[PDB]
RNA sequence: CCAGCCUAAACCGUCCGGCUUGUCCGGGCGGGGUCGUGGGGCCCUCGGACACCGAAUCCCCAGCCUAGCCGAAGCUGUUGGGA
């Protein structure tokens with residue numbers, strides 16, 4: 001199953017990564033112990049938000065320190 | 074015998090809570106949509122209100138069921154216990 005781990009996992013990977021693992025492992029350990037979440041079409045969408053949001057969030061914080069770069073120099 | 078309709082989804086709006094506050098996620102309500110000569114959504118150009126079609130829902134009556142009522146024309150003999 002496709003899941004989205006919200007935790008630095010050893011064999012799996014870092015947070016926010018999407019990796020397919022054996023059902024039982026996620027169904028009876030990851031998902032239950034809150035290490036990951038079933039990567040449904042609903043969650044993948046809510047992940048595009050965390051990506052795009054923080055993206056233009058720092059992309060705009062650098063686009064603002066872009067004005068101070070032009071003038072303070 | 075006779076007859077065809079409603080919805081899910083896209084898409085727009087709202088109220089609620091969840092949470093990593095986000096152009097989001099889900100839930101409930103409303104609008105939209107309903108088809109095979111393919112249809113619908115959103116974006117453009119246009120004439121439609123006063124156009125027409127119209128119930129399987131509601132309303133009035135007719136009619137009918139549950140009691141009834143009117144309804145023509147004869148009398149004398151005669152056998153017989155009795156016409």
Ligand SMILES: [Mg+2]
Nearest residue numbers: 041042098099
């Ligand atoms: Mg959904």
Ligand SMILES: [Mg+2]
Nearest residue numbers: 041042045098
């Ligand atoms: Mg959605």
Ligand SMILES: [Mg+2]
Nearest residue numbers: 080103104105
């Ligand atoms: Mg509806």
Ligand SMILES: [Mg+2]
Nearest residue numbers: 082083084099
């Ligand atoms: Mg929806």
Ligand SMILES: [Mg+2]
Nearest residue numbers: 042098099100
């Ligand atoms: Mg929804």
Ligand SMILES: [Mg+2]
Nearest residue numbers: 087099100101
């Ligand atoms: Mg909603």
Ligand SMILES: [Mg+2]
Nearest residue numbers: 081082099100
């Ligand atoms: Mg739904």
Ligand SMILES: [Mg+2]
Nearest residue numbers: 080081101102
């Ligand atoms: Mg519903």
Ligand SMILES: [Mg+2]
Nearest residue numbers: 103104105106
């Ligand atoms: Mg409707």
Ligand SMILES: [Mg+2]
Nearest residue numbers: 105106113114
């Ligand atoms: Mg429309």
Ligand SMILES: [Mg+2]
Nearest residue numbers: 079105106107
């Ligand atoms: Mg409709």
Ligand SMILES: [Mg+2]
Nearest residue numbers: 105106107113
């Ligand atoms: Mg239409």
Ligand SMILES: [Mg+2]
Nearest residue numbers: 078107108109
């Ligand atoms: Mg059909």
Ligand SMILES: [Mg+2]
Nearest residue numbers: 111112113114
């Ligand atoms: Mg089409």
Ligand SMILES: [Mg+2]
Nearest residue numbers: 125126127128
């Ligand atoms: Mg009519």
Ligand SMILES: [Mg+2]
Nearest residue numbers: 131132133134
């Ligand atoms: Mg009546």
